[model samples]
Target: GEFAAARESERQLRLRLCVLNEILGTERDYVGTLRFLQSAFLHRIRQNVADSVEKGLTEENVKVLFSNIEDILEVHKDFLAALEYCLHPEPQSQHELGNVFLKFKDKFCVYEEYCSNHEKALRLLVELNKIPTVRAFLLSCMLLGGRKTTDIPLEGYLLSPIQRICKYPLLLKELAKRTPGKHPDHPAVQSALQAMKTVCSNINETKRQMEKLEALEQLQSHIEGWEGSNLTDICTQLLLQGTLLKISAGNIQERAFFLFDNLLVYCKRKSLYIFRGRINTEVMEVENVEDGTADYHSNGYTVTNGWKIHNTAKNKWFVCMAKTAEEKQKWLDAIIREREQRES
Candidate 1:
């Protein structure tokens, strides 16, 4: 019954070739973009440093914009070189992929630095473009290269590393999908895919932490009546920050509430936050309640979605109202989750 497998061999062979086309073609395209960024601008700028430096474009500042892009560029070039080697034909003509991908596994970690620096580099680029001389110098990058100058913006090149890192997982999955389960490449295809997924996840994790920390720093500086430990030192993450209706003694007033990992603040919003109250999340409790829709109207308050909180350490309780059911649930859920993490 199983002897009729020759016909299926043709289909499997076609599938294997499809896998190769995907990983190889996109990888080639990525390398070319990276090369253009290095040779056309990064390298050229260094050689022509004196002129741009005299014209108020410091090479050091330019490096800050590109970050450690040169090292990433070098690493990708070698990976592409390894990829080209994989597809090279032999006397038997059987192609390979897993061997090379897993071999250069550690090299891809070079992307870690490039991706982490991306957010800052992008913001720095925007500010650099504001200066007449800096703006002219950046746009003039293409005009200074050794080869025939082309017309493409410099900003697009710096955006490619994070984009390229994201592409590998999808590309690896495509290849794995096309190849049969029994193929020699299947195991490494799966392994490489998992590796890329882990790397991308890690890069994103750090990206978010830095972003939260940066926003917290801004909040720390603008907050009035600063007291206790600074927001940055106490909390690594900021869960939510926005305006909500503060309810006290059967009256409603708008207040800015910032929810963090270990701290919560009830403050008044003006030119700056007039710090009013603070509570450690470890000593907080969220008392969820069920009530009819019309009960909110019977009371003087207009909001239907209300949250109850107990600051157990101080023996004080607080009630706040939100305009939407979704908003109310978010606060309760976030507060409950933080409490659960602490109590456990």
Candidate 2:
């Protein structure tokens, strides 16, 4: 028991080592899966299927189908080699794990492009599967390139890279947590964790913006009575969107609300949506209200959780409601949040 502190410290070091090894193990497999994407289907398509217009897969179309995955693989390929070397320090040197992450941090920006392309890549893959020769190759005898197991489809492999990007922070956190504050690697480990957190945020923000663009594109074609006016020009950003009860004079009607940064449009369903009314959030006022506020307006039907959006410029009222008290809270906050943000 005299040396109890030493033994406990050694135990803590083992946890740190265990966490570090786990990252390497998972990362090694992650790199291999990306290699599979490149070697198995992508290479086959490039050599054999790329020329086949029968599938409409020219080299250009092939580029779109995979979307900068080679660049992603290149980033990891270097990192994997970097990680493998740090874990082993010959006979004299110590493990320099954190710097390995920090040194290559700049290379991670490739993930932003890769992240945005993930959905589009899947969409193209699904479309290409409809092409016969392509699907033939996709289905061919490509068992585990190693440790022989079941075949994973290209779609499954395609999903792996994005997962890897999202995974880095968790690994960093575990390593950072296990590393002692007094340990030489401590500061570097914390820094690496911070860097990876920013990486995730950057990738996520770009990914979200892409989805927002797609939503607005979808709404543009869906909503009617706006042949000339596009939502994009009216609003640089989409604040929130959902279906809500639009409380008019004596009755409540269901309308889908597409809230933009500066404007809020409530529309009825049409071919997709028929534009019914638009309110400039600039003149808007929002509040939470009690149940039965609009229940008096609807005949036999009634509304429970509700909110009011007042247009001060026109001095008119717009009452809307959600299905539950919690949902009403969300809608009410989202409107107020949007207004405050825009004002600032």
Candidate 3:
């Protein structure tokens, strides 16, 4: 199998070079942050070491920030150099460049290490901010300020590198796609793509956990009263929670539900507008509905997409409806799985 036509290959290569140049430019620009940390931040910290200590900013914290920033700078410098070589590769050197990228998994490992340390650096920054003197010095060193700066904070710059690292997976994957299978560089591109994918997966999982925790925190803050108070621990393992409608007494009532690893809560926003409520998972059961009217009274409300949540004692039951069959089944399956997970 031959590669694509020489002209087409050249066009693809040029496009890739354009992207690589953009990436390298970003990398080069951010490298100055390392220089800034060394020149400005560390200088200020040392000059005010006594004031920093009295104000709760430790020398150890400053050291960690410096070390981590330098580690990333050194690793990314090599990565950028590799990109530059690939941009203008010689014919004989192209084969060697491909082999060079095949070992890029180590680069991904370093980037993962960078992400972990960067997170700690963020915390260190927060802690440093708690000290009035240290905070003032750091804030005063910002490149832009007052009305000139947008609402975006300086911490956003710390985030930009991680975001850029995550983008590499998509870029490498696209490059691999453009490189024809028979091209000598194709194998190396594929290898680099896999490594970047691993990096993205690690970053995404961490982001997902953070997002879930944030959602739980927001839910906890909005919940009102003791029944919702008992829900605090349950919310930690919150799998799903949303608004569900309960059909009863020929009137539709809006209910808020929280689904957890081992419990289900049904809530109501009271006439006074407070959110609260209960239902235990250990003694609960759910059933699919074929006919809404026969299984439960709906006041002829056209309850085609329906399911029932009932107590194991069979003394109480509530019929719930979804706007569509798919949504109906989703509610049914989630409840059933939650029940089974609790029992098992």
Candidate 4:
């Protein structure tokens, strides 16, 4: 019995060693031994999950897991070596990539296994979401300077890893609040809150701008339906009437396109001017074949060379200064006011 107990202790200890060997590499050979390490990492993840659940391991257990992973990843920090290691043809790089994914997946799966292994563990589901957040944030930070995937979304490409150095930990802290009695630390929560606030603020700005643009479009659409009314007509009549308030020619067309097809139903305007297209003064489109030119940029107005947009319905040319936020706003305000005054 005494000898049997000794053997069991040696077994677990050996298992731990195997895990470390796979990750940290007992051989440093980067080939055969490393393949063993990869399999060990996968196997260890299973063991870690089982051990954490069955024994009710604390966050320290996870910390240890993370530390070992950090060690394994760091060992191959040489750029070429790391690339080579990650790039092996089958199990070499690509399989390793999938295996790396398995690491995260297994973490979650480990949590899930905990739930299934013990019905009482169902309460810990919220705790699992935090694991991915932590993993994503940490790995992102570690791999920020390195290439991973080519198709990372624009926002994820911009934000994920930076969040680790900047706000990721805080976000994870907030997430950790899912654990009862485990409120996130103030700094982490504050950083996370600020990030949330920034995201909300951007959404609000976009919504406001979109709403304003939509409203302006409605106006343009109404004006468009007015007999002989293209953006050109609107600008020409406005110009002929010396009504150049603050908007540029670009604003006229930008408003018109966004507001096309339903202008009269919305604004009840009678008509706008229609005319043949002409060359803008500064930018010459004749030199280029792209059908547009770069004219000039002023305070809020960017006039381009003659870029003609033909309205087949009206048989008219619509030349614009340029479609810019400022130009849109300037013309929108002027159109609202001028139409009101003219109708009155």
Q: For each candidate in turn, give its C-alpha RMSD to the true structure in angstroms.
A: 5.0, 5.4, 7.6, 23.3
Candidate 4, residue 339: Cα displacement in angstroms equals: 26
State, as a TM-score between 0 and 1, how close model 4 is to the true structure. 0.20
Candidate 4 lDDT over 44-114, as tens digits, reads 44546664444444565444332233333333334224434644531221022222222232122112212
Against the reference, the lDDT scores of all candidates come to 0.75, 0.75, 0.63, 0.34
State the TM-score for model 1. Answer: 0.76
Off by over 4 Å in 1: 1-8, 11-15, 89-93, 146-151, 242-254, 285-330
Question: Of 1 and 4, which scores higher on TM-score?
Answer: 1
lDDT of 3 at 118: 65
Ten-residue region with minimum lDDT total, candidate 3: 89-98
- Number of clashing residue pairs in every model? 0, 0, 0, 12
Q: What TM-score goes with each of the models?
A: 0.76, 0.72, 0.56, 0.20
Task: Give candidate 2 misplaced runs (Cα > 4 Å).
Answer: 1-15, 49-51, 55-61, 84-93, 141-149, 227-229, 234-257, 266-268, 276-279, 283-335
Pairs clashing within candidate 3: none
TM-score of 2: 0.72
Q: Indicate the residue-level lDDT of 338 in model 1.
A: 81
- Residue 200's lDDT in candidate 2: 86
lDDT per residue for candidate 2 within 1-344, as digits (tens), equals 75998898778778777787778888889888777777866766556663455655677666776788888888888998888787764211136578999998889999888768777878888887897876654566254234233555667777787788878888888877877777788799889989988988988999998788787888777777864467767666677778889877655689988878788888887558898888888888776666654334344344477766788888877578787677677677777788778867
Off by over 4 Å in 4: 1-184, 225-344
Model 4: per-residue Cα lDDT at residue 93: 12
